[PDB]
């Protein structure tokens, strides 16, 4: 297990932090959050969606075909 003070080397980097009792826990939750969700959805929709759309079409066709095959045809 590693420990702080032995992780890596860093130089010339300043970090400004504010106390949690000094700031909001939900700053602009909807006024800023909803735009960010839409940005992230657009960036990944084309990678995630087409596979499951392909599943949905194969699912419905296979179920429709299985239903029709079980119904008899006139001789």
């Amino acid at each position: 297990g590693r420990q702080f003070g032995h992780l890596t080397r860093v130089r010339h980097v300043i970090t400004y932090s504010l106390s949690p009792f000094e700031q909001r826990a939900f700053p602009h939750y909807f006024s800023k959050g909803i735009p960010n969700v839409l940005r992230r959805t657009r960036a990944c929709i084309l990678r995630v969606a087409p596979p499951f759309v392909a599943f949905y079409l194969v699912y419905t066709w296979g179920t429709q075909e299985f239903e029709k095959s079980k119904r008899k045809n006139p001789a």
Binding site: I14, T15, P20, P27
Partner: protein
């Protein structure tokens, strides 16, 4: 005859997410089981004491247990004997074993009903549709003697003759004993038999939703409170040149 007909969804009063059983319908449904079903169907996992505080008083349920005779013993001579039922007895089985049952029902075996609603897809919707769904065989279907056409039963050929009909019993509260009425009450009772915790679980479910509706945003708020130190932190890089 491998075609299937699935039961429709009837609007049972316990269908909803927060909706309890109707205990008046349970009470009437027990009367259907006792008078009509109990002569062919066992209920090995329900005892008279289970009725107490659900649909009968203790005195009522005691008197109900005393209406039948059950075996007990041995006595001091090593003999078994009969006594009136008490609250601790399970409902009497109609047959000692399934072989006698098959012999008494043209070879078919009436299943135990303690769990019938949970052991069949569609639950009370299936049972309601089966009891109330008998009809003449379609053209070209000829069932052997002993079997009865019922389109909701798998294979459409069932060894149980239609067991309910108008005025099969009289209800204690005067309710008209129509086929659909008797079916609705017996199905409600059978649901309770298979899931006695139904009402209590729905009450707990309501409390669980309300507490989660409190705890989820508060715990979420604790997470963001601590994390706000990091989420608003600002970085700057000032290397020597």
């Amino acid at each position: 005859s491998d075609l299937e007909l699935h039961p429709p969804s009837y609007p049972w009063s316990h269908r909803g997410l927060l909706s309890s059983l109707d205990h008046t319908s349970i009470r009437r449904g027990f009367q259907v089981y006792k008078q009509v079903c109990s002569s062919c169907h066992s209920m090995d996992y329900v005892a008279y004491r289970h009725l107490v505080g659900v649909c009968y008083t203790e005195d009522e349920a005691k008197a109900l247990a005393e209406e039948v005779e059950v075996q007990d013993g041995p006595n001091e001579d090593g003999e078994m004997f009969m006594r009136p039922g008490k609250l601790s007895d399970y409902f009497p089985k109609p047959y000692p074993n399934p072989e006698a049952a098959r012999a008494a029902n043209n070879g078919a075996l009436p299943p135990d009903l303690s769990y019938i609603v949970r052991a069949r897809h569609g639950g009370e919707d299936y049972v309601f549709s089966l009891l109330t769904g008998y009809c003449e065989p379609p053209t070209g279907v000829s069932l052997r003697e002993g079997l009865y056409f019922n389109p909701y039963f798998p294979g459409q050929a069932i060894g149980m003759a239609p067991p309910i009909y108008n005025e099969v019993l009289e209800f204690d509260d005067g309710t008209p004993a129509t086929m659909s009425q008797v079916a609705k009450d017996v199905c409600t009772f059978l649901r309770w038999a298979a899931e006695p915790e139904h009402d209590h679980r729905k009450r707990m479910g309501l409390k669980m939703l309300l507490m989660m509706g409190l705890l989820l945003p508060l715990v979420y708020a604790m997470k963001r409170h601590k994390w706000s130190v990091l989420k608003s932190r600002k970085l700057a890089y000032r290397p020597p040149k």
